[PDB]
Design a protein around this nucleic acid. Structure first.
Ligand code: MG
Ligand code: MG
Ligand code: MG
Ligand code: MG
Ligand code: MG
Ligand code: MG
Ligand code: MG
Ligand code: MG
Ligand code: MG
Ligand code: MG
Ligand code: MG
Ligand code: MG
Ligand code: MG
Ligand code: MG
Ligand code: MG
Ligand code: MG
Ligand code: MG
Ligand code: MG
Ligand code: MG
Ligand code: MG
Ligand code: MG
Ligand code: MG
Lengths: 225, 53, 125, 147, 187, 128
RNA sequence: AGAGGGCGUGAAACCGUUAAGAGGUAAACGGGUGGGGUCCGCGCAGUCCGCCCGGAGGAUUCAACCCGGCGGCGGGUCCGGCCGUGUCGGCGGCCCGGCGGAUCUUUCCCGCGCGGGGGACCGUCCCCCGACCGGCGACCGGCCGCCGCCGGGCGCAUUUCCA
RNA sequence: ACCCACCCGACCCGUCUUGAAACACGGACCAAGGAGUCUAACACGUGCGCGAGUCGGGGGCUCGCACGAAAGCCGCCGUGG
RNA sequence: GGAGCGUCGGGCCCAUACCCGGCCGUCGCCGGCAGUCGAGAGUGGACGGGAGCGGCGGGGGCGGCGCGCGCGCGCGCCCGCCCCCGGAGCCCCGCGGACGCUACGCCGCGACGAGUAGGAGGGCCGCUGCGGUGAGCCUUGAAGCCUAGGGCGCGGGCCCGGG
């Protein structure tokens, strides 16, 4: 009875440890691979342009797939259509951010809420900072902090997303499974902008903070995140 | 004033009914009184049926 | 049954005593004075109770038979232990553990015994 | 129990749950069923359709005992009799069929609702419905009128 | 600030039964435990139904139980009813059953045992089959109470067949202006 | 060398001053005893700046130290001796208070029993 | 009489005085500190106790071990007998087992086709023993094992006590 | 928690009102009293009992009622609703 | 030579808004706990013959389903064992189970919290009287009254000291 069971229990324990080791290595190589991918992406946009500039030519790069959207004004006295859109983007509180994948449909929605948001095309860094510093998964409807992969895997593992790095990869690349990984990220509760704003009430182009500021959302993200 | 569905009902408390309320706190003492009377008649009509005819 | 009469008694018993945000229970053979299911002398088929001895010295353990409750005159069986503290506790410990009698109480019964024993000695300055 | 009623909770609150704009005035509608035709008209004519107006024949010195005619359905006709009539029958082997006097048990008419079990019966009653008759015949029985 | 309606945040469903009877509370205690610890959803339905009101757990007749168990397949199976089993006087031949119910009326109890049936309390059902395996869970008809004839689209509203509340039915209690076409109109 | 409690945590109170009633300062007919004001125009009931504060459940005490005396015990109003032997198995966490109505001869009896049982009495030196 | 003839208790508004503190934006109020008072807890070191351990001092008696008694627990062999659930056998209580029935019989009896009582019948409740099974907190008796208490023995590398 | 000081805040409550610190009304001060009740009828919700039934009255039988003008029972148990 | 007006910089100031943290409550979790293994769980266990370093010689997949803390192993001596928790000594224990379990109890995670009229819930909030109950309290002093005394409660209020 006794030693046979004991040994069986010790065997199980090892088999587990082996599995965890194997998963850990997988993760490690996926991260290595995404490092190499991002390196290639960054270089090849330069590569292209340089080759266009060699000829009397231009390289118009890809219109951006994904944007970060920060609600920059409050919850009083807000139009009904605007209010609906804001709560379809998951922007209830002021200074909540979300990733949003761009497309004819989504862009027209961002336009209907322009004076209520600031938004633009986030960096890789920006995506990393957001997810690591302020990444909380919607797990059984409970906002829960992403302290270990076990959480992400538990919810997203059916999509080949098994660690924080994979999550970042899916959000940044806007992969097949973007919607699902993005919805799993609870909306980003950023603080107030350190260094203040320019002007909440007006559009960026005319001095303000509202509307699309494309590249320059990254500066805003650092001062809030 | 009626409010959204009910029995359109007509209580008969428009006369001075509280002048003519008949309470029943007697009834016990009444029942006892009747039963005492009944027992007396039985004793009077000695071997006759208490019932009556 | 046990649980049925607990449902009857849980809030109403004469032995119960509320007041001042606590609740308590004065029913005999309830060590820990609690209005609990676990700790309630009257309800259970098997019961422990650790009172002090009437002598002034020692403790009495009070173990319930099972033979026949219905007959409260015979139900509880008492036993004085007038021994050197450590042994007194071991006597009660065995009684509960090695008999397999209400092992829920085991340690609570020991603590009570301990508090009784503390209570009966030269007091202070 | 006043203890459990509402007015105990309303102590303190000024209007006592009747609002301070419009108050609890005495009789704002009119007393009772006032305004059925004017001003409470909608209530009366979407919850009591048919209240107003006459209909049918008067009948002066009605007495209910004349028209007394309680009914029993075939559904539960055998319930009138003790089970051992229904049992000693589906047995016996004479093709007897027991009698069910319906008037004895306090019904005058025998109406036709329900399945009757395949088991002959003589049913004595004051009146029958057409279908109630037909069912008994099909079971293998006989209706019997009685005064 | 955050915009959420706090209007329908609190769900209104029952948690425990409102009744104070001790035996029903013991059953609840039993079935809570079985509901959470097992994977059976039978235990979860039974629990939910133990909390509900008298109205809300109506009486199942004998005849309706018979016919539901008559159905092809559920043979040699225990019928379960959180309400009461009553007689049907207008059913005669009663098969031999297995029945769980909080109550069974005396006449119905006689009828079922005479036929060679068995009657179980809910504690007995738990010891027999903790995960509700091999059970037909039934209920009496919820919409039986007269009450529901008065609900719906109000009477005096076209194509509504809703019993109006009336002190006494007869020739001259309603059935004039608003029912006869000959008097004003009809719906 | 009095009876220590089992654990003596830092009791922290959110507010110490009594909530007092509106205009209880202005009148002798109005008592300090709190009432929520239900006036239509009322500085206080509509939470203006620089007014008396209204008690909410926000000011509630931390469950660990609620009803905890400064000593670290909670009271329990003992009335007679038999009612002390309840506390026997707590004594580290609750303390007997002997009642006002209890006579001077049997206050003495309660106190000595408590001392034997090591139950802390919160008003022992008093009647005499 | 700090109960004095409209006198038990003796609140508030209001007033007198005594004590303390303040005082040119009427007072009063909320928040925050500070100053002063009133008492209350201390300490004439508060270094607070509780386990276990090590040491050095004193202290009586036992734990361990058996022996004799008592009591309790639990156990199966259900061993023996009481106890009761479901089933089967006795048709055995059935008339020495009663009620109920629109089941029957007026072969009966009594009273006047009906009432009462028998007599069949059906439903329901009780005896006899055997068998199987849930052996069920429904109990006894022996046997076993364990625990506890008392009383014997065990004189001191054990045994508790005390500082 | 008694008093005093200082900084900051701070208009008087109740009320009708779209709007009250209002040049809107009530209010010198304190005590005690002081306003959603009971009956009937309906409705829906909920709890309990019984369930094709259910029912209790009214009456009757059991006590001088200490507690009783209760409690209990009734081929009245169902005339009847 | 702005403390004005128009255009613009840096820097700083503070809301009950935003972020992090504490604490109170409410809501939600098919939430957890009546006593058990187990953290992307992706089995466990008889039992029979045949055998053994064998294994299940499947993707630059970057991997999840299979591998390097053992499967067989050290001991008794190629054969036997691979044994029992009243004792493995325990990070898991399926033999028995809280310090915890007033199951109307206890415990854990999230989220949220303006409010007139109005609605609902909970009040170990409060008053007077009745059935029960506290071997309650009380001339060794009840009720009431007063208190720059000590405390509890978010609060309604309450408890203690002195008079
Ligand atoms: Mg605005
Ligand atoms: Mg007469
Ligand atoms: Mg209000
Ligand atoms: Mg209202
Ligand atoms: Mg008003
Ligand atoms: Mg009105
Ligand atoms: Mg108006
Ligand atoms: Mg709200
Ligand atoms: Mg709601
Ligand atoms: Mg206003
Ligand atoms: Mg006097
Ligand atoms: Mg007097
Ligand atoms: Mg006087
Ligand atoms: Mg004075
Ligand atoms: Mg002076
Ligand atoms: Mg005003
Ligand atoms: Mg003016
Ligand atoms: Mg006016
Ligand atoms: Mg005036
Ligand atoms: Mg008053
Ligand atoms: Mg109802
Ligand atoms: Mg609120």
């Amino acid at each position: 009875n006794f030693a046979e069971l004991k040994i069986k229990r010790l065997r199980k324990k090892f088999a587990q440890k082996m599995l965890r080791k194997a998963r850990r290595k997988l993760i490690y190589e996926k991260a290595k691979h995404y490092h190499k991918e991002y390196r290639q992406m960054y270089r090849t946009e330069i590569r292209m342009a340089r080759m266009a500039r060699k000829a009397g030519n231009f390289y118009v790069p890809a219109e951006p797939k994904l944007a970060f959207v920060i609600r920059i004004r409050g919850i009083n006295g807000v139009s009904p259509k605007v209010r609906k859109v804001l709560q379809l983007l998951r922007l209830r509180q002021i200074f909540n951010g979300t990733f949003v994948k761009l497309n004819k449909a989504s862009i027209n929605m961002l336009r209907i809420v322009e004076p209520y948001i600031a938004w633009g095309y986030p960096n890789l860094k920006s995506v990393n900072e957001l997810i690591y510093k302020r990444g909380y998964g919607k797990i059984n409807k409970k906002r829960i902090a992403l302290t270990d992969n076990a959480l992400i895997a538990r919810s997203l593992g059916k999509y080949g997303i098994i660690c924080m790095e994979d999550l970042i990869h899916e959000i940044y690349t806007v992969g097949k499974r973007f919607k699902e990984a993005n919805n799993f990220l609870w909306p980003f509760k950023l603080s107030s902008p350190r260094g203040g704003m320019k002007k909440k009430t007006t559009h960026f182009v005319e001095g303000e903070d509202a509307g699309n500021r494309e590249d320059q959302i990254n500066r805003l993200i650092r001062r809030m995140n | 004033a009626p409010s959204r569905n009910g029995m359109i009902l007509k209580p008969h408390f428009h006369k001075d009914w509280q002048r003519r309320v008949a309470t029943w706190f007697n009834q016990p003492a009444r029942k006892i009184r009747r039963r005492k009377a009944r027992q007396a008649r039985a004793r009077r009509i000695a071997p006759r049926p208490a019932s009556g005819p | 049954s046990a649980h049925l009469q607990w449902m009857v008694v849980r809030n109403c018993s004469s032995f119960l005593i509320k007041r001042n945000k606590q609740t308590y229970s004065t029913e005999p053979n309830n060590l820990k004075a609690r209005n609990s299911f676990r700790y309630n002398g009257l309800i259970h088929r098997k019961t422990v109770g650790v009172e002090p001895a009437a002598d002034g010295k020692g403790v009495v353990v009070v173990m319930k038979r099972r033979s026949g409750q219905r007959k409260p005159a015979t139900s509880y069986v008492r036993t004085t232990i007038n021994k050197n503290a450590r042994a007194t506790l071991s006597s009660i410990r065995h009684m509960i553990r090695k008999n397999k009698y209400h092992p829920d109480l085991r340690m609570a019964a020991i603590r009570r015994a301990s508090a009784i024993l503390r209570s009966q000695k030269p007091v202070m300055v | 129990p006043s203890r459990l009623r509402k007015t105990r909770k309303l102590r303190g609150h000024v209007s006592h749950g009747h609002g301070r704009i419009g108050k609890h005035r005495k009789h704002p509608g009119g007393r009772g069923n006032a305004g059925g035709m004017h001003h409470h008209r909608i209530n009366f004519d979407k919850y009591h359709p048919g209240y107003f107006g006459k209909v049918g024949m008067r009948h002066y010195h009605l007495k209910r005992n004349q028209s007394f005619c309680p009914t029993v359905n075939l559904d539960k006709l055998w319930t009138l009799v003790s089970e051992q009539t229904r049992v000693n029958a589906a047995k016996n082997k004479t093709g007897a069929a027991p009698i069910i006097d319906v008037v004895r048990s306090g019904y005058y008419k025998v109406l036709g609702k329900g399945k009757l079990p395949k088991q002959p019966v003589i049913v004595k009653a004051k009146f029958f419905s057409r279908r109630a008759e037909e069912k008994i015949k099909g079971v293998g029985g006989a209706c019997v009128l009685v005064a | 600030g955050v915009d959420i309606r706090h209007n329908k945040d609190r769900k209104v469903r029952r948690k425990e039964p409102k009744s104070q009877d001790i035996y029903l509370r013991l059953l609840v205690k039993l079935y809570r435990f079985l509901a959470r610890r097992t994977n059976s959803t039978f235990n979860q339905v039974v629990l939910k139904r133990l909390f509900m009101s008298r109205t809300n757990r109506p009486p199942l007749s004998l005849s309706r139980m018979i016919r539901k168990m008559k159905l092809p397949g559920r043979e040699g199976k225990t019928a379960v009813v959180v309400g009461t089993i009553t007689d049907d006087v207008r059913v005669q031949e009663v098969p031999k059953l297995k029945v769980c119910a909080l109550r069974v009326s005396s006449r119905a109890r006689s009828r079922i045992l005479k036929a060679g049936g068995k009657i179980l309390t809910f504690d007995q059902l738990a010891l027999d089959s903790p995960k509700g395996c091999g059970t037909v869970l039934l209920s009496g008809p919820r919409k039986g109470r007269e009450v529901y004839r008065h609900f719906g689209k109000a009477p005096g509203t076209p194509h509504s067949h809703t019993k109006p509340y009336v002190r006494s039915k007869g020739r001259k209690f309603e059935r004039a202006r608003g029912r006869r076409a000959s008097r004003g109109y009809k719906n | 060398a009095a009876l220590r409690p089992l654990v003596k945590p830092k009791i922290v109170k959110k507010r110490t001053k009594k909530f007092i009633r509106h205009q209880s300062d202005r009148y002798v007919k109005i008592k300090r005893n709190w009432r929520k004001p239900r006036g239509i125009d009322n500085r206080v009931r509509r939470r203006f700046k620089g007014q008396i504060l209204m008690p909410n459940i926000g000011y509630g005490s931390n469950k660990k130290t609620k009803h905890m005396l400064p000593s670290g015990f909670r009271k329990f109003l003992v009335h007679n001796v038999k009612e002390l032997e309840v506390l026997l198995m707590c004594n580290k966490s609750y303390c007997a208070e002997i009642a006002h109505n209890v006579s001077s001869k049997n206050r003495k009896a309660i106190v000595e029993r408590a001392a034997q049982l090591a139950i802390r009495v919160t008003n022992p030196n008093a009647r005499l």
